[PDB]
């Protein structure tokens, strides 16, 4: 009748909130933002990466339709994943008064440290566009039924 | 009747509002821009590339002919993705108070790394140019049916 | 009748203000200028190459002669966007106060990078002179016919 | 009446989308990039071969003529696949500050490898030129009837 | 009646914008470039060979007459394609501040890679100044009859 | 009556400006230049070579008598390719601050490379100037005859 | 009644898809690869000889025809065999950095190893095309009859 | 009536497309080529050998007289295969930085194995040109009577 | 009538535009030219050899008399074939800076090769004077008689 199946398996904790709206709309101004710095790695995870939490937990998927993509086991254990972290977490202070005298990539950090959390970032935002535009993991009409083992029959004023 | 089919595959969150008017005439004046520099790329990403954002998500295709291209999947997932991440990402500081005294190209950053931001810019911006003037991506009227099926069919005061 | 057939294929965006005109005479006054320099590469940018922007859009060739020409396809496809771009951008300030105590081309920047902006615009702006007095781009008579199907008739005081 | 025959045999997840539009017009366009370079490998690999992913999957072939390419067993099992992986793959930092000081092709790397990425693309771009426009894969209409075995009877209003 | 036969065959993806016009007079100033340099072979690429775009899909070969080659089987096959990779596509940059110290073409790259970039570009270039104006290829009156089939019989005010 | 017959076979995109006038007289002055050199290679291309474009498209041959010399297929398909491109190519820097110190041509290049080029430069325009002032190209008035159908006959005021 | 006899004797697996079309044409152009070298024994061994993979097993030869060459026991047991493995697998790396410096071909392998991998490839291409398209194998009308025992009677919707 | 008799023996594969054309008169051209060489080996591969492939399956024969010549089975089955694979295949490095210092032809390669491929090469293009515009192959009117069966009758508007 | 009998034997693809012309007045000058060299070899087989493609088709030999000379058959099979190929093909590069120091003629190539290039040349240059001057192959008026049957006959403004 109406259940998950084999542990409890749920991942409607990473993505689903996700899909079409926030996901192919934000990821182009977003890709838009400070990076070789310190404030846009910030906030980055801030808003898209830390907010896709589904209301969907199990109280609420009578709207039959699909839009809403169960965004998860498939395309983003790469990406939301390895991206997440991959790039810098937020620390960066080697500016003493004079920003370039003289040991500031000589004797603190180096080169391909700081420099490679940007474009790590860079094809990782893209890589995401193509693939959860189409890629497997889409919640929709015949896959939720996969899903929640779908039976659930109602007819007078049950709908109210 | 009036519908798109397969995952809900949308990506007019990219670009439909470009195609003619900002693409080949912005893409000259803005060719011509503060580059080496830090003012240029910053305002850059800001104007052509953040805002193409599409009024069109479904509520209105009813002007009938074609200019508005569907520019997206083809021509630009090399160009407006890889540019717009590749020039150097706003933070520029070397300069202590005499403009080269003496790690300004040796202990902070390298030649390679702020130079090749800027004619990565060059060409990326001209292949533009001449591909979506004319390479595949256009949605004018055998095209928007293609993506849309259409069929609407309405007589008399049905248009007020 | 009167139209543009295949997609929006327009360039009128890039030249066709430009031909006689701004073209041969401005290229020799403007040969002639700041370009070791930091002022001669930033207002040139400026003038010839920022524009070209015709009037033509849509809305007037009823001037039926041929002077301007539709300077974009063959021609300026190299030169107009990279000796553009080519010169090098705007930002230029090695000096501290002495101009040359000891890293002025050491440890900031080096040779080649400086030097060799200056002659990638001295051939590229006569390359233009040749070409674009002959070289195939001109919309004159029967090939402002060839872009724009033309026939349009009238009689009258249809003409005020 | 209806099906596909042997396993579930399946490859329209590889080309054919792509055949007559992007294949022969891109590959022109695209045969001139940003090779000996980092540029152009990393969104050649993008746009072309990334995506021609048919919305064929089951759900409309409809459109009963023949354009699209099964493009996939004969010709496309060399090229798309050995090419695709065949050019250098993305990492591309040789330099230090000076571009040749002294192990730059002698200790980090060395000749063939990088070179030999750059004309092992050459022919294989044009090999898919000639072959594709006619060699054995087209999707036509009595070769859409060998794939999907093709019966599908429908009289008054069962197309609405 | 009007149809092309086989399978979608089409390669006015390549040439036939071209025949008469950009080819021998453009290969004539073109073939005067700049070569053993960087400049010269990254804007080549872009102008004759990147476009010969033909306008010439399929909606209108009305223009009886020839002039227009279908440039591409037989000449091309060759040269617009071993030719247009063959140069060294544009990444050239060997000099530290001293033009030869001393890994100049010792330890970085080598004599032959290089300087026979120069004359592969020399030769290909004069081959199609003989073969294209006359050899086998050009979309003429009974050519064009050849490759689409030529019956559209039309009477009054069909061609209004 | 009035035409050319076979393709359009058309080369006075080559030569026929040239015969007579430029071409023995500048020969003797150019052949006088500065070819070891950077600057002499260089302005040569642009000046002798880069224009021969006669004005002779089909517009006017009205001066009936022969001067003018359709020097293209015979003499000048060695000489004004092989040697056009044969001379160096513009990119000439070796030095460092000092003349020859010690890689001048140990590392960077070598003797035959750039020495041979100023002798190929030699022997070329003197064969040039034998041949062309008495060898089969010339188009005089049996021999414009023989490329365009010459018939055409008009009268009176047909003349103004 | 319907049925192979004596062992379970099928080669089903080995060609029969392949006859006419994959055959000789691409015999030709195939014929037509990177030999001498790496890449083309590769893909060569990928396309044309790991896929002849009839859809033939046993589930459906209804198609009463012959075109279809059961392309084995005799032509191919010298030819797809000794050939598929005769030109040298896959891992061909000699090269340091000088391609000829000096035990090239000396201490690492020697020169008919090599060498004669290219024409053992080139006379078994030949001997394949004239013998397959005549020699013994095809799988026609009377000879379908003979492999598989041909008896197989329905009438009316048995058909569908 | 209408067919090819006995297996399905078909060889318009090869060579039909091909005869008085793009032979005698290639032939000549491309006899004149780059052999010693690396590029003309390569390159002719690729036109004259590779593109004979007839649009002559069986769609369309209704051009009743004969030029075309099913050039396969006699003249043909030495030539284009023995001379197809017999010049060198295109993989062609021995040099180091300096041309012959000292296993040049020694210790990588020998002298008959580089030189003589190019006048394998010589004869072998003669050859084709006496036998195959005399030579027994042609398909005219009473010949292509002999390969497929030739009645069929057809009287009004089956023409249309 | 008016018709070539037997194959479509043409070779108008070989030599008649050359008889008199270009023939033994070009083999003086030319005779005189680069050989030991490289720049001689080279050009030559452009200029003499490459062209004598004739207009004569089909399409014109209403000038009745006799100059041109279907010069293939007989005299030219040895001689345009064997020496057009015979002179080495242009790739020559011994060459490391000192011109002979050690394995100039003992380890990259030998005597006889290069040398005896030189002297092929010579004789066969001659053989051609003497014989094409008077020997069998001359297009003249009974003898183009020959080739094409020749009646054709009209009146009055047929002419024009």
Wanted: aromatic share 10%; hydrophobic share 40%.
């Amino acid at each position: 009748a109406y259940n998950p199946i084999t542990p409890s398996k749920l991942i409607a904790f990473s993505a689903s909130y996700v899909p079409v709206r926030t996901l192919l709309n934000f990821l182009v101004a977003s890709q838009g933002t400070a990076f070789q710095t310190q404030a846009g790695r910030d906030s980055f995870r801030e808003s898209l990466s830390a907010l896709p939490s589904s209301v969907v937990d199990i109280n609420s998927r009578f709207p039959d339709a699909g839009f809403y993509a169960f965004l998860n086991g498939p395309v983003l254990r790469p990406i939301f994943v390895s991206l997440l972290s991959s790039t810098d977490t937020r620390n960066r202070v080697i500016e003493v008064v004079d920003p370039s005298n003289p040991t500031t990539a000589e004797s603190l950090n180096a080169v391909k440290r700081t420099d490679d959390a940007s474009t790590a970032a860079r094809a990782e935002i893209d890589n995401l566009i193509e693939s959860i535009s189409k890629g497997f993991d889409v919640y929709d009409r015949a896959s939720f039924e996969a899903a929640f083992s779908v039976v659930w029959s109602e007819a007078t004023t049950s709908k109210a």
